[model samples]
Structures are given as C-alpha cells and as structure tokens.
Target: AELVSDKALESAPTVGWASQNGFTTGGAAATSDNIYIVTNISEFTSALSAGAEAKIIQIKGTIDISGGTPYTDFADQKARSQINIPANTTVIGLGTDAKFINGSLIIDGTDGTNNVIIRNVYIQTPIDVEPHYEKGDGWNAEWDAMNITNGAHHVWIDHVTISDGNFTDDMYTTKDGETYVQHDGALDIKRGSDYVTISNSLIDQHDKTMLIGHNDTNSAQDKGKLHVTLFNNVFNRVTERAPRVRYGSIHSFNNVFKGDAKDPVYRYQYSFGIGTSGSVLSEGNSFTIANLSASKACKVVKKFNGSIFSDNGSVLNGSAVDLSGCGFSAYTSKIPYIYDVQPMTTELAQSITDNAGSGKL
Candidate 1:
C-alpha cells in the first residue's frame, strides 16, 4: 500500500541538517495500519511498540506521567515513565496542549534509531529524583527531556517547546550544592548522533538548554559524528549551552536568544560552550544584552578545551560584538549543506518568538 503522512509534515520539506546528507521522512510514508491516535499513556506507549513497520503517533492531550507523587518518591517515576521511539517513527501532538510531562524520552544509541521526527509537542522535564554530584560542575541531574544518543542520525525536531514547566519551587531548591540543579538539558544530543536538525522550537526557562556532545574524553565515539544544524529557534530565558558543542561540525544561524535582566534562578552562563575538537559556524544570530548575572551582559561563547569557531554577522543589543574570544578563534569551515540563511532583523526576531512553538505549526 502507498503511504502518506499527515498534512503538517507534508506541508514543507525539512530545511536543515536532517535533510543534509539524506532526507528524514519519518512516518511521512506511513500506511493506515501505521497510524495511531492516542489519548492516554497506555495507548501512547503501545503505539510506539514493535510490529508497526513505521508509525505516525498523534498525541491528543496532556499526558502527565508525573503521577502526582511527592518529588522525593518520584524516584521510581523515572524508570517507570521512560519512552523510546523507534526508527522511522513520527510523534506529533494534535495542538499546543498535546503535552508530555516528566520522565524522559530516549532515542537509544543504535543503528536502528534513525529518521525519527518529533513535531509540535510540548515537553516538560521532571525535577531530578536522583542527581550525580560533582566538585566543580555542581549537582548534575540524571535525565533530560529528550536524549538523542549513540549514533542516531537523521532526526528532525521541529516546533517543539521544552522547559521546566514553570516549577517555581523547584527552580530555587538547592540540591547538594548551591546551584539549582533539578533538571538536565532540555534537549541533549550526544554520543555520536548526526545529521539532526532542530528548528522552529521554543526552549524556555531552562538551564543547560542543549548539549551537543556528552564527554570531552569520549573522542573515540564522538570525534567524527554529531553533525547538527539549528535555525530559526528562540531561546527564552535559558541560561547556557544554547548548545554546548564538542568534536563535531555544527552550524547555527538566524536564531534569537532572548535573555532576562536579573533572573536569580537559572542565572545566565555563556550561551555557546565550545569544547574539545568541535568546529562551530555561527552566523546572523541575535543575542540580547540582558542575559547574565549582576553584570547583565551576554558573553556569547566560552571555550571548554575547544579552539575552532567562525562567528560572523551576529548582533548583541542591536550592535556588533566580537564572539571569537574566550580562548577560541574563528575559522573558515564551510557548511556542508545548502539552506537559506537570513540576515538578522527585528521583524525576524519577533516572528521567531511568535511562531517557534507547538501551537503555531
């Protein structure tokens, strides 16, 4: 039987790295037998199960798997509430309210986890029930809202909203250290994931927004992979790592980074963390000045054993700023793929903030 995707994925072809080396169709070719509309966790989990050659799983409502348990007892919640989407799968929401709360969505590190699409969904991460403490890094949380790891390639994440779900109490709750470490990265791509594009998304009120490479020492697995592109997204009040990169060629362009003036909780760190052998090309991105601590200045790039970067035509507070410092310098690495790279403008910034989330798509 011939297969056809829902109207949204068919409306436009993907525009970034997910369409770079090859195309990411997801469930665009799913047959009727491969489509499922789910309203609850049970049906949702079943739709992601095996036997479907490909799937278009549409979530209909907010599925809060937090279970309303006390935060401490939410320890069991992480293991019990995990979700894994197979390759050639598309998981989308009916509208802005089709939400996924708590737990973590894991795309396992394997050859089978490729060409996955996640669109127009809201994902709120849980406060960590268990955290791994470090001396210099403070408290590190266990899970992330979305984890794309271990050689997964050709993944497209579009028009998604990822955040802490407005947990005011948890925002300031000091764990084993002084810093608030209730959650991990809003969306983490690590362990050799490649050809992934994240676009038209809103990353709100979060710390460690995105992590492109996991470990600085894991060059054996991360050296040649983790090719990613991020375009036309809005980072609202996020602290750092818009995303932190390591050991890959990354391209970021025409994105908006909106900062808060004096956010005590989730205070600003550097926006881009260049680590290890990572090569980054940042062009025409907007960074507002009100993004950091008492200084209230936006320091765009910070190096973590990283040295190669090319930053051009970016703005800070409507004016030009140098970005190739922080123990790093610029390069001339050309982006391997072709896509429209727009110049930064006020109207484009407004448009990004307005249409970067689930409801707009």
Candidate 2:
C-alpha cells in the first residue's frame, strides 16, 4: 500500500492505502494515504464493481448524487450499489476544506454489515428537483442523506453535519406544520449488532434524528443490546429528540436538544424491556424548549432502573425529574408528556436535484 492523491487514486481500481495496522484483520487502523478523492458520485458504482474497500475515504471535491434510485429489485436480486468497507475502516473528511456534497451516501450493507467510522463530513440532499420519495415513507426519497444499516455495529458517526437541503417553504412538514423530512436519521441496526455511537453531530429537519433497533414483522427483532452513547451532540431546529433507543442501555450526556418548531414530545427517555430490560443514564444534558416561555427539566419513563438525572452544573429548569409509569418513587400529571407523539399523517418532501448549491430534499 502507498499514499495516493485524490486524482491518482480515483483512476485506479480498488485503491489501496498504507495502513497503520499493517493490513491485519482487525484492531486500530489508520491510513497512510492522504485521502481517496471520489471524483464524482458515479465513481462509487465503479468502485463497487471492483469490490473496493478502504481503511479511510477522504472526499476532496463536491460530489453530488441527487434523485438517485435504489436497486430496481433489491430484494429479488439481493443486490445493492454502495460504498462497502471492511471491518475497522475509517472514513474521514478533511473538514469544510475537503467537501463531499450531493444526496447522502447510503451504505447498503448487503454483505453483512461491519464496523465503520465516519467523521467530519457535511452530507446533504440535492437542491432543486423534487426528490424521488416523500418523507417517512420507509424510504426518504426526496432527501435521504445517510442510511447506515443492515447488521452494522460498533459504527461511529461523529463531528458530521447532516440535513435535508430544503429548509425553506417547509415542504417536509406534518399537517400541523411539523417538519420531519429534512433530517431523518433513520440509522437502523439490525439483529446481531451492538454498540453504536453517534456523537458531536448537528442534525436538522427530519424529526426522528436517529433510530436504533428496527423491528420488522417479517424479520427477527434487531433490538440493539449493549451500550449506545449519544454525547456532546447538537440537535438544532428539529421537531424530535436526537435519538430513539431500544432493548439497550442509553448513556446520553452533555448533549444540547434545541427545538425550533414545536418539539416532538421527547418520547421513551427512560423505558426498558422492549426485548430486554435495559437502564438509561441521563445527566448534564440541556434542552432549550423555545415553544414554552420557560425551559423545563428532564423527564423519565417507567420500567427503567439504575438511572441518575442531574443538571450537574448545567442550567436546570422546570422540575428536576418528572416521571411516568409505575415503580417511580412518585408520579405527576404535571409531567406533561414523559413520552410524546408522532404525527399520524405523512409530510410531503421536496428534493434538490441540482449540483451547484446546497442539496435540499
């Protein structure tokens, strides 16, 4: 393996970079190369054909793929086009200087999902045309920036900015004007995966910021067990909490949840036993609930144990802890919504098809 530039690396098939771990099967690995500059989005299709995998992928230019369609018969053919990586592969972006644009980069994970590291990338949808699909339709057609799923585990999403490009007109809004399409975290961890971390990222629009452990009727439950940590992240101008966890212990601390529109009720903050009884520990987190003139404190749910809640040297508001469900030391109606609701109707979403400016979906 050798260090290759963006231009030179793209011209070759299955580009290889020098690895700090000496190309062993696993362990902490680092690329000796500068970055793999994907000249354009279509390069991924060729890279897939060549079975390319990397310890790191660095995007050097604006690469946009808007209004892209899924494999016509993905399930039938069991096929997908994606940027597949081997275990312990770390994808790095060189800040705003080295940019990766266009619609989100989707990891199909058709070949048994494995650990991946993605950091410091600004992922957005196309900017002009109506994206291919509407919001919350199982597939975010208009603006899906990232879908990291299919038994993926030990995956880390950090220091990255993700949002649907369309912030104006509010096309991706519920009937009552709640926007849920722009920032759909929709990151699924299928069965047999565990320990996923999403930290220090800024998410906008789409209500469900991050969804873990998807339960499908036809398939077995993929309730992620072990620890899921959401720390030091900023959730801004969104109608939802930063994440929804399942069958696992969630350690959420020091994250700022800033609600722009009527915040989606923070649901299931502390509940357990979806597939198993797990604990939730929340501390030092702050919420700026603008809809209410005054800020409120945190809330806890039932069936949760071994948890601690404290402002811990942060701005404390409302009640320290308002809990719902049985087994709490006390319950209160004053706890408006220990768990909130999701809109019943579908929200229309638009896509940005152009590659010139920010891609909005």
Candidate 3:
C-alpha cells in the first residue's frame, strides 16, 4: 500500500523539499517533520515564503493551468496560499487525486496562531469573478474559496471540497434597473477566528457555499466565536446559506441537503443565523425542498437558542421536511429514523479516513 510516489516513502526522508514534480531534496534544516511535495501553486508561493517548519505538507498532483497560464500569480498577489503552519502542521492531501487547485491553501498565524489542521485536501479556486458586482460595488466581495485570516486559533476544515466560485453571469444593474446575481463562498471564516470545526465535506455551488461571521463592529475585533461543527456532510446546489453564521456557537448535525439553484424555487433557506449564541441542532438530516416552502428547513435571525429535531424529514415540491423557522412551525411531525435526539458519534472519523485516502467518496 505504499504508492504515494513522486518519491519519498521508501520509509520516508527526503527532508527539506520543493517541487514541480521531479521530487528530490534532503536540504535538511526545516523541521516539525518537513514534507513539502507541492506540485504547483507556483510551488505553493515559494513554499509559503519559506520560513519552513510546518510539518506534514504533502500534496502530490493535479494543481492545474500549467503553461497555458491559469494559475494567475495567485490572483495577482492577493497572496493567500500564504502557508504558515506551527501547531502540528499537517496539510497532507496525497490521495483525493492529490489536488490543491488554482490557489488558496493559506494558514497564516505563525507563533501565536494555535493548533492548525487541514486534512485530506481538495480545495478549489476559480469562480470566474461571481457574475459581476452591484450590491453596493463589493460584488459580494469574492474571497472564501478557502480562507482563514490573521488571528487563527484551533482550526480544522476537514475532508474538503469547497466548491467553484463565481462562474460568468456578469451583467449588473440596480437603482431601478433590476438584474442581480453575484457570488463568493465555499468556506469563509473571518478574522479573530476561534475553535472551528467543519467536518466530513462535500459542499457545492448555491451562491458559492458557506460563510461564518466576519462583520467587524470591533467589539474586541467584531466578536466571532466559532465552536462550530457540522457532521457527515453533503449539500449540492445549496443556494443561500448552507451556513451564514455571525458571532458563533453552532453544532449542526448529520447532514444531506440536496440541489436546486438560480432561484429554482427553493426560496432560500438551507441555513442562516445572525449574532448567534448557541443550540440549533437539526438532527440526522436529509432535506430537499423546492416550492412547498414554509421556511423550508432553517432560517434564523436574532434569538434561536435551542432546537434538537429528531429523525428529520423534508421533500416539499419533491422531498418533504418543513419547519417554518423563527422558533419552528409548519407541523407535520414523524421523524424517527432511529434518532432519539443525538446518539451517533465517530470522533473525527479517523482524521478523515486517514487523510482522504481512496480519493474521497
């Protein structure tokens, strides 16, 4: 079972390395278990500015665009493959086709940045600039193809697949000339980041994907506390808010929210929260709403402190399970697929199947 070739693993030890895939380096001085094998993100932006010492950096293939030019100097130096790993640094994506595309695998917080871990990578970047700005000119701000800013703490973006950003819809007009659609998401956890955890992944493009609190009103740097954890995932055409949390303490359970976007009648409500305080645990899920929309699953604002749905169900317009948000309503209760409100647990799922082996499924 030793086929992670591009060299090194003949009982490992190639030491200080960098590659475009010729694989040969024993430069020796960068430790923590130095294992850089990046095949290109422009050599991971010069090995994330080579101050070294970020252990287990093991990427092996498919970082595309090659010589025809598409890896555009990291979006022309918005510079965020900015690798700075210190807390048991382990970015090992040797499987899942060994990919770390177009750009973005950043983790900047060198000494006081706390325990960092990004398992079995498959991060994407190339959203074609999300349609074309017109929500007051920020064009939905365009970042989060996988972002983690300055004050990073105990972070974890497990078994990843953060999806494609903006893909050509470009044509904007507001101020009475109506016509809008701008995008940017697929994991955006803002500054002053806290104990974060985004488990078992497979998120897709429904307006870019997930985002969590970063509005900065400066109450001790905008106060965004993420004790976040969303388990066993799978959300496909997820248009608005698979996650749009602000301030934090979310722990969403057992997921599976199916597709439909470009306003295909889902009427936006897969997940949303603001100034969050705690408790919103929709258990063992599998939702698929279309137009029988009665708050079609989840949509919250202000106070939503406790909820622990059992068994879960939804398919209005095809997949039934409806809850009329703002404290739950639209009753049709019958949710017992063996869920007596929280019982299943597989602690970190073996570090995501031992670093996304078998190329993720």
Candidate 4:
C-alpha cells in the first residue's frame, strides 16, 4: 500500500514493522465492520466498545471531554474517562477542526492489543492541575494525552498535534508557588511497547513532553524493547524529554526543538534524556535557542546511567556542535527497520514549524 503525502511514511524508504505486522492498511477504504464515524464522546465510546477488529474510527467536530469544567478537577472525572483504542484500530480526525479538548487515549497491549494508528487529531490538556509537591494530596490525575503502554506493538501516530491547551498562552501559569506542571506528557510509550512510530506531529507548549520508559526499575519489561521512530516532529517550547528514552532503540530524525525565549517562566533543559541502557540515533535534527542564557544551558542530550547515543548532522543553536563529545557512548548499529533518510536542511525548522500540527493538513 502506498502511503499518502500527508502520512508519516510518505517519504520513508520502508513502512517499518507496521507493514510487516498486518497494519499496512489503516482506514483508507472502509467497510461496515471497519468504519465508525463519531462526532461526540458518547458515540466515540460506543464505537470503541463495539470491538470491531481492524476498525477505522473517524472523528468529526470537537469532542469535549472537559467534564463541564475547563481546567479544574471535578467529580465524575475518574480514570474511566480515558478512551482506550482497541486492537487493530485506526483513529483519524476529519480535517483540521476535529479535536479532543480534555481527555486521554490509552492503547494497552496487556490484552494483546496491537496494530493501531492515530492520526490527524488535536489532543489538548488531557489533565489540568498544578504539580503535586507532596503525596496524598489527592491531586493526581491522568496527565498524558496519549498513553501507549503494556507491551503494545505496531502503533503509528502521525500528523497530530498534542498540546497543553488550546494555545501556547494557556499552557503555563504565572502565579508563584505553582510551576508549569499542569500536564505530564504529550505521549508516553512504556511497559514493553515496541515497533511504534511518532512522526509529523506537534508536541508543543508543555513541560514534560514524552517519556519512553516509565521508570528506572522497569528494566525487566523495558530492556531490549520499546523501539520507536520519532521523525519530522516539532517539539516547541517543551522544556525536557521531547522524549526521554530508557532501555530502547530510538531513531529520531529531522525533528525540531524550539525553546521558549519570550516567556519568563521558561525553564529550558536538555532536550533528549538518555536513561539507563537506551540507544538513540539522532540524525539531521535541529535545536534552536532564543536567548544566550538558554543557548548556554540548552544542552542537546542529558545522560543518565549508561546509555548509548550518536548523532550525525545535527544542529544546536543555529550551528553544528560536536555531539560525539556529548558524554554518551556512540550508537553504532544501523536501525533495524527500513527507512528513508532525509537530509537536514537550513530551512528544516521553518518547514517543520509550518507543516506540523493538525490544522496544516
């Protein structure tokens, strides 16, 4: 099957494990058993509960899962509010206006769920709250827009926008004593998940962007798993993690990381956090800083434990830096999947800035 221009694999040489694993066709053409068009939360839940395998779930209009209140915690806002994408399902939004305001999508592979695709959707502020400083405050909630977990496999997320709120202005707080911890991650792939691709998406205006491994002690489930491809995505004003990887082989190519210079609350940290036993091959990526303080503090990669990372043709703060000396070991092996290599260009930042997010498509 030929991938469309708007799709992530359009320019890639190969489709990765998704094609090899019977996920090559994703709702391009639909049948009664394979299509579900939803315009609201109830219809969306009903379609998912029907459990149609290889189904194409098309979303229309805006689905507000905000629980009547925009940013406050309320009753009935239980963990059950999360939408779980079933196995062999492809969820796509209709055009640019289709969006999910306040909710999360979980893809749990503990039940053998696999072969899923989520594309062309806008996910905003899955949870809203200040960061929990102490335990037992009862303020904990689901913080990620997309949580791909529990050994899930063959999943692809493309051309999507995952943000902290409707816009960048609403992402953080200016009040003292409350830091910018309103959300956790835009997407998280953990718990033995493998063969995933997150491409052509915008993960913007958030503090903790994406996390690959859940923690340091999950090596039993994480080591030698959690393979992911992050390509052509924009990590805008994201403080850290764009994603932090642990115990995985990650291929991050041709992506952009833009720091927030104008915001006084901006706390710029290193972009890629290489944790415990992870191997990341960062190629043709760009990181731009707006201020001199950020330019000095904006390290590209921060290593924890003993991780392996290598970079070729990557730019930091408008110039190329010696990533070989960035403190992590070299990533020597070629990526196991077949993929097209797009050379990084000077206009890479602008290209990704313009083309990323939901409305562009």
Candidate with best TM-score: 1
Model 2 residue 295 distance off true place after TM-score fit, in angstroms = 8.5
List candidate 4 segments past 4 Å from native.
1-30, 66-75, 129-141, 167-180, 216-218, 261-263, 292-298
- Name the 10 consecutive residues with the lowest summed lDDT in model 4: 4-13
How far out, in Å, is residue 80 in model 2? Answer: 8.7
Report lDDT (Cα) of residue 223, candidate 2: 38
Clashing pairs in 1: none
TM-score of 1: 0.89
lDDT for predicted candidate 3 compared with the true structure: 0.47
Superior candidate under TM-score, 1 versus 3: 1
lDDT of 2 by residue, 22-132 (tens): 222221243454234455666534433322244455554555442145334323112232234545554555435334444445544556545566666676533323223
Off by over 4 Å in 1: 1-5, 11-14, 67-75, 135-138, 168-170, 174-180, 291-298, 322-327
Instruction: List the lowest-lDDT window of 10 residues for candidate 1.
Output: 1-10
Q: Which stretches of candidate 2 lie over 4 Å from their true place?
A: 1-35, 44-54, 67-86, 97-102, 107-110, 125-143, 167-169, 172-186, 218-226, 261-279, 293-361
Model 2 quality (TM-score): 0.60
Q: lDDT per residue, candidate 1, 29-114, as tens digits? A: 77787788877777878778843366788878887665554445444755566688888888888865888887777787574688
Instruction: Tell me the lDDT of model 2 at 218.
Output: 31
Report clashes for each candidate as comma-separated counts.
Answer: 0, 21, 12, 1
Could you give candidate 4's per-residue lDDT for residues 1-361 as a string of tens digits?
A: 2222334222222545444334534444445665667888887887777453656777787887754555444344444457788776777777777788777888998888777778888998565553455453433335678898988888888788987765453545544444344556778989988888777889877767788888746467798888888888898878788778888778888898888545454466778888888888888898776763423532678888656988888777677766776567888866656776566666767888789888665
Q: What's the TM for model 4?
A: 0.86
Give the higher-TM-score candidate: 3 or 4: 4
